């Protein structure tokens, strides 16, 4: 409505948060912050729910 935030970003999440997400998903919680995020994004894009059909 006002002064709100529409859209979640992994970056915002801390190292502990990123690792937690990977654990629940069942991915490798190894590497650094970038490693966790990169893996999360790759998985999201691959296991995309809605079609990319943009426009």
From Swiss-Prot:
Low expression in spleen, liver, pancreas, testis, thymus, heart, and kidney. Increased levels are seen in hepatocellular carcinoma and pancreatic adenocarcinoma. The chain holds residues 6 to 47 of 210 of the full protein. Belongs to the SAP domain-containing ribonucleoprotein family. Binds both single-stranded and double-stranded DNA with higher affinity for the single-stranded form. Specifically binds to scaffold/matrix attachment region DNA. Also binds single-stranded RNA. Enhances RNA unwinding activity of DDX39A. May participate in important transcriptional or translational control of cell growth, metabolism and carcinogenesis. Component of the TREX complex which is thought to couple mRNA transcription, processing and nuclear export, and specifically associates with spliced mRNA and not with unspliced pre-mRNA. It comes from the Eukaryota. The modification N6-acetyllysine is found at residue 12. Induction: By EPO/erythropoietin. It is found in: Nucleus; Nucleus speckle. Residues 10-44 form the SAP domain. Interacts with DDX39A. Interacts with FUS. Interacts (via the C-terminal domain) with DDX39B; the interaction is direct and facilitates RNA binding of DDX39B. Component of the transcription/export (TREX) complex at least composed of ALYREF/THOC4, DDX39B, SARNP/CIP29, CHTOP and the THO subcomplex; TREX seems to have dynamic structure involving ATP-dependent remodeling; in the complex interacts directly with DDX39B in a ATP-dependent manner which bridges it to ALYREF/THOC4. This is SAP domain-containing ribonucleoprotein.
